[PDB]
């Protein structure tokens, strides 16, 4: 369902054909200067394979930020065109509009084998389907108009390449609209599906999910679905104290208690025993007398519990130790979830040590996947990106996929 | 299972007399130059405020959001003009405060008429409400987790009793929805009514329970369709979707009509589950087709067997399919409706959805419980002004969808029992 999709590295003879590539260019910009060039850098291998493979034109469509169907100086793709010139060694044509009888007239009769970037897709209301007007009121797009926009994209090119995995969860016009015969994943999309398929379709057992973060309540379905696929789970960092008070009536102090989530842990634990999943909650905690880096700290176990005005912010050394046997015996791991407040040096040991083990287990041969933001922020703070099998770029779609969702942008691809 | 409804409400709440009550309201309302162009959402909270008022209550502190300011004070989304509207509706003074937490707010709340209504400014001006935001430049910014902690405990300081009358942001776990850690957490009159009808229809419904789904895409409604098939007895799939179903299942010559490439790959899986679960599926059998996606185009009628000629498109259900709604709808004892049966925004292609609506009106009077999932289906009921002829027109976008998709709704879970 997820790993049998047509990819760019199979498109026999794309020579002399017009290619539309949906890319992810949602980059940090600050006074017209791109603060982080990492996306777009990631786009080159697909742009380049199209170059060396023939290809009359290479049309690039993407979005930046959330402009909500209105034009907006703040979210232009123009500085992205500037950067691409330095990275390709050629002039890049940047057009101020996405669709029209005039833009397909500037693509045609523009240097052969060249790349063209079109202006932000979300400047049109018909990309998403909904907008907000000049005053800040939700506007909905005419159905006639969305249909027209999708027809206009479809006639910009001959072949559609989708290299924007971070939007595949949205059923937007660029995801489900380009109705050409050949619809293939770019290299980025390819690598996303390849690994997610490797861990979700037919993984090699045991299969571990490391979950973490503050709330239990937004990660309900994320847990529910996983308990079907997963062999073992580590629940940690914040959401653990909710599990602890509800299951072991542990004294929690002023630790983050998720009242919405507290209602459902019983349900989760029932499904867990039912699906035969090992659970591994923390067994001990580093606690502090105030939620900041520079506060007094000590250690308590699950049975001693937490003093009445103190709070747990990281797993204790024994829980850390306890995930030596859990991670190292696993032949595939899905992470996504810090094991405490890693942004805070003192209360970071847990997440850092967890990473060291995942790096190690990858070295031992296992397949490892890092999920959303935060966890990736850690992987990138530590500069360990490629000691892990895969770190998913964009947590919109990666969460949804791990959640059990279908992903419209993946289904729109050929086979 | 079980969690929806059987929750607490203002109704059946003793000991409200002399208490500071924090009410989470839905004031996300259309505005131009400080002039609220539709006050429905505001008048809707009047029962809640009134009952609280009429019960004692030292203070009635209102917290809400307007639009998507993304964690920054932004003038186009200030709640000030609402306070001006509430003054007109309650016939008294209403205190509007620029902040929503902190030292000063708590003091200025305390020194105010001992039965007063106070409106605090847009929650979403604080990054900690949603949890994420965007900075002045346009780049995504994530909130510090200890700042959320302070924000959530600050809102809890504001009052003694919490009342949540903002179904519609129940599907999101924002600070104002799961952060007010007070002993008494109860639903408002609007919330109570949402929770009441959905459980009435999704837990122990009068059978036969009918779902009516419609719209352009089928690729985004997969989770909706799937979760509904294990609780429903009848289902009508209409307008836009229908074609994607008709080409996959009946090999229909479909014309230029809307085809969902993403969705066609799932039609199979759906019909298998529908048969497994013994759910009758109803699909249009004739169509109104045009030679152009435009009102006042050329129109004629064709059966699915005749098929749509090339370069023509189906834009509405045909007369026999419309006629065929009678027996499906009028024999149902409970109806869930989330999707128009055609391009109803064009008079020429609205006969389907309108005639559907009249039949849903007709079965309500026959004693059935009818619910409009709405958004797009809602605006039709509005346009026809028949919002009263239906048991419940859900006043919630994504929260009603995620509930009908079988998800959990943090806002709800966080209420007392």
**Local structure of residue B276 (DSSP, 8 states):** H
Question: In chain B, which residues are followed by a C-to-N distance beyond 2.5 Å, i.e. a gap?
Answer: none
The residues, ordered by sequence, that sit 6+ positions from B193 with a Cβ below 8 Å of its Cβ are: B392
Cα A255 to Cα A285, A352, B45, B133, distances in angstroms: 11, 21, 34, 25
Residue B187 burial (CB count, 10 A):
28
- Name the CATH architecture for the domain at A195-403: 3-Layer(aba) Sandwich (3.40)
Q: Which residues on B lie below 8 Å from A258 (Cβ)?
A: 178
Q: Does domain B197-405 have CATH number 3.40.50.1260?
A: yes
CA distances to A296, A404, A413 from A410, in Å: 49, 14, 6
DSSP state letter for B188: -
Cβ atoms within 10 Å, residue A179: 15
Strand partners, B119: B62, B96
CA-angle at A125, arms to A17 and B240, nearest 5°:
80
* Residue B222 CA: distances (Å) to CA of B252, B271, B278, B297: 22, 12, 18, 32
Contact A259 B178 (CB under 8 A): yes
Residues sharing a CB contact under 8 Å with residue B383, sequence separation 6 or more, in sequence order: none
Question: HSE-up of A313 (CA within 13 Å, CB side)?
Answer: 26
B376 with A140: Cβ contact below 8 A: yes
Annotated catalytic sites of B, by residue? 41, 217, 375, 398
Please state whether A278 falls in left (phi above 0), alpha (psi between -120 and 50) or beta.
beta
- State how far the Cα of B302 lies from the Cα of B313, in Å rounded to an integer: 11
> Distance (Å, rounded) from C-alpha B142 to C-alpha B145?
9
SS3 (DSSP) at B373: coil
Phi and psi, residue B9, nearest 5°: -150, 170
| Separation CA B315–CA B342 (nearest Å) | 6
Phi, psi of A114 (to 5 degrees): -95, 165
The beta-strand segments (E) located in B112-201 are: 116-120, 132-134, 140-142, 161-164, 184-187
Q: Which run of H or of E encompasses B313?
A: strand B313-317
Distance CA B103, CA B134 (A): 26
Burial of A102 (0-12, 13-18, 19+ CB in 10 A): exposed
B133 phi, psi to nearest 5 deg: -160, -170
Rounded to whole angstroms, the Cα distance separating B238 from A33 reads 49
d(CA B302, CA A298): 77
Handedness of CA A170, A174, A177, A179 (dihedral sign): negative
- Mapped onto helix, strand or coil, the DSSP state of residue B101 is coil
DSSP H or E segment with residue B335? strand B334-338
Asked if A171 and B219 come within 8 Å (Cβ–Cβ), the reply is: yes
Residue A236 Rama label (left phi>0; alpha psi -120 to 50; beta) = beta
Q: How far is CA A394 from CA A69, A244, A265, B85, B151, in A?
A: 22, 31, 28, 42, 27
Catalytic residue among A18, A22, A39, A232: A39
Kind and range of the H or E run holding B202: helix B189-202
CA A348 to chain centre: 23
DSSP classification of residue B277: T
> What's the rounded Cα separation, in Å, for the pair A299 and A302?
10
* Burial group, residue A310, by CB count within 10 angstroms (0-12, 13-18, 19+): buried
Q: Are strands A232-238 and A207-213 parallel, antiparallel or unpaired?
A: parallel
Domain A3-188: homologous superfamily in CATH: Phosphoglycerate kinase, N-terminal domain (3.40.50.1260)
Distance CA B180, CA B154 (A): 9
How far apart are alpha carbons A368 and B281 in whole angstroms? Answer: 42
B197-405 has the same fold as B5-190: yes
Does the B5-190 domain belong in CATH 3.40.50.1260? yes
Contact A135 B32 (CB under 8 A): yes
Whole-angstrom Cα distance, residue B240 to residue B215?
A: 6
Does A136 sit within 8 Å of B77, measured CB to CB?
Answer: yes
Helix (H) or strand (E) holding B24: strand B20-24
Residue B318 has phi, psi (to 5 degrees) of: -85, 175
Residue B285 · residue B256 · CB < 8 Å: no
C-alpha A238/C-alpha A236 separation (Å) is: 6
Contact B288, B314 (CB under 8 A): yes
**Closest CA relative to residue A288, chosen from A314, A250, A264, A269:** A314
Tell me the shortest Cα–Cα distance from B107 to chain A, in angstroms: 25
**Experimental approach:** X-ray
B256 alpha-carbon distance from chain centroid: 32
Total length of chain A: 415
Contact B181, B203 (CB under 8 A): no
CB atoms within 10 A of CB B11: 11
For helices B189-202 and B46-53, give the axis angle rounded to 10 degrees.
120
- Determine contact, residues A323/A288, Cβ cutoff 8 Å: no
In whole angstroms, what is the distance from residue A205 CA to residue A202 CA?
9
Q: Which strands, in side-by-side order, build the sheet including B334-338?
A: B280-282, B234-240, B209-215, B334-338, B369-372, B392-393
| DSSP conformation class of B304 | T
For chain B, what are the domain ranges? 5-190, 197-405
Pairing of strands B94-97, B116-120: parallel
Reduce the secondary structure of chain A to three states and give it as a string.
Answer: CCCCCCEHHHCCCCCCCCEEEEECCCCCEECCEECCCHHHHCCHHHHHHHHHCCCCEEEEECCCCCCCCCCCHHHCCHHHHHHHHHHHCCCCEEECCCCCCCCHHHHCCCCCCEEEEECCHHHCCCCCCEEECCCCCEEECCHHHHHHHHHHHHCCCCEEEEECHHHCCCCCHHHHCCCCCCEEECHHHHHHHHHHHHHHCCCCCCEEEEEEECCCCCCHHHHHHHHHHCCEEEEEEEHHHHHHHHHHCCCCCCCCCCHHHHCCHHHHHHHHHHCCCECCCCCEEEEECCCCCCCCEEEEECCCCCCCCCEEEEECHHHHHHCCHHHHCCCEEECCCCCECCCCHHHCHHHHHHHHHHHHHHHCCCEEEECCCCHHHHHHHCCCHHHCCEECCCHHHHHHHHHCCCCHHHHCCCC
Residues in contact with A231: Cβ distance below 8 Å, sequence separation at least 6, in sequence order: A205, A206, A207, A208, A277, A278, A330
- For the purposes of burial, counting CB atoms within 10 Å of the CB of A26, is it exposed (0-12), middle (13-18) or buried (19 or more)? buried
* Tokens 């400014």, residue located: B121
Strands A207-213 and A19-23, by their bridges, are unpaired
Chain centroid to Cα B43, Å, comes to: 17
Q: Are B117 and B90 in contact (CB under 8 A)?
A: yes
Q: Which two tokens stand for residue B305?
A: 């067997």
From CA B117, how far away is CA B86, in angstroms rounded? 9
* Helices and strands, number each (H, E), in chain B: 17, 19
- Chain A residues within an 8 Å CB radius of B76: 135-136
**Partner residue facing B343 (CB), from A143, A214, A343:** A143
b/e map B75-111, b = 16+ CB within 10 Å: eebbbebbbebbeeeeeeebbbbebbbeeebeeebee
Instruction: Give backbone dihedrals phi and psi of A167, rounded to 5 degrees, phi first.
Output: -130, 0
DSSP B212-272: EEEES-SSSSHHHHHHHTTT-SEEEEEEEHHHHHHHHHH----TT----HHHHHHHHHHHH
Distance CA A271, CA A260 (A): 18
Element (H, E) at B337: strand B334-338
- Total residues belonging to chain B: 417
Residue B180: phi and psi, rounded to 5, are -75, 85
Q: Which three-class secondary structure state does DSSP give residue B309?
A: coil
What is the Cα–Cα distance from A263 to A220, expressed in whole angstroms?
11
Write out the binding residues of A for (2R)-3-phosphoglycerate.
23-26, 38-39, 62-63, 65-66, 121-122, 169-170
Can you spell out the DSSP letters for B315-329?
EEE-HHHHHTHHHHH
Q: Hey, of A131, A171, A178, which one would you mutate to test binding to chain B, going by the most B CBs within 10 A of its CB?
A: A171
Quick one: tokens of A351? Answer: 């997440």
Which residue in A81, A98, A80, A82 sits closest to A29, CA to CA? A80
């Amino acid at each position: 369902h997820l790993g049998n999709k047509l990819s760019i590295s199979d498109l026999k003879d794309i020579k002399n054909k017009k290619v539309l590539v949906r890319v992810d260019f949602n980059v940090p910009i600050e006074n017209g200067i791109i603060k982080d060039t990492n996306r777009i850098t990631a786009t080159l291998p697909t742009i380049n394979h199209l170059k060396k493979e023939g290809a009359s034109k290479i049309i690039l469509i993407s979005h930046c930020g959330r402009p909500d169907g209105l034009r907006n100086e703040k979210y232009t793709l123009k500085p992205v065109a500037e950067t691409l010139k330095g990275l390709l060694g050629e002039e890049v044509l940047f057009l101020n509009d996405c669709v029209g009888k005039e833009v397909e007239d500037k693509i045609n009769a523009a240097k052969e084998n060249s790349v063209i970037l079109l202006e932000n897709l979300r400047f049109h209301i018909e990309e998403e389907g909904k907008g907000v007007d000049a005053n800040g009121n939700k506007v909905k797009a005419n159905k006639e108009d969305v249909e027209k926009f999708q027809n206009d994209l479809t006639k910009l090119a001959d072949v559609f390449i989708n290299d924007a995995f971070g939007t595949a969860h949205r059923a937007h016009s660029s995801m489900v609209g380009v109705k050409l015969n050949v619809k293939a994943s770019g290299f980025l999309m390819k690598k996303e599906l390849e690994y997610f398929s490797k861990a979700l379709e037919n993984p090699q057992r045991p299969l571990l999910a490391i979950l973490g973060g503050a709330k239990v309540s937004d990660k309900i379905q994320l847990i529910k679905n996983l308990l079907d696929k997963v062999d073992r789970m580590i629940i940690g960092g914040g959401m653990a104290y909710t599990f602890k008070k509800v299951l072991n009536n542990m004294k929690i102090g002023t630790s983050l208690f998720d009242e919405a989530g507290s209602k459902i842990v019983g349900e989760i634990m029932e499904k867990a025993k039912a699906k035969n999943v090992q659970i591994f909650l923390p067994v001990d905690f580093k606690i502090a007398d105030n939620f900041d880096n520079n506060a007094n700290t000590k250690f308590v176990t699950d049975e001693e519990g937490i003093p009445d005005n103190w709070m747990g912010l990281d797993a204790g050394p024994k829980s850390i130790e306890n995930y030596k046997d859990v991670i190292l015996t696993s032949k595939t791991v899905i992470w996504n979830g810090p094991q405490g407040v890693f942004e805070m040096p003192n209360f970071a040991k847990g997440s850092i040590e967890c990473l060291n083990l995942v790096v190690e287990v990858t070295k031992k041969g296992a397949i490892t996947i890092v999920g959303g933001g935060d966890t990736a922020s850690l992987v990138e703070q530590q500069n360990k990106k490629n000691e892990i099998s895969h770190v998913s770029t964009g947590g919109g779609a990666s969460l949804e996929l791990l959640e059990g969702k279908e992903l419209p942008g993946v289904l729109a691809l050929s086979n």
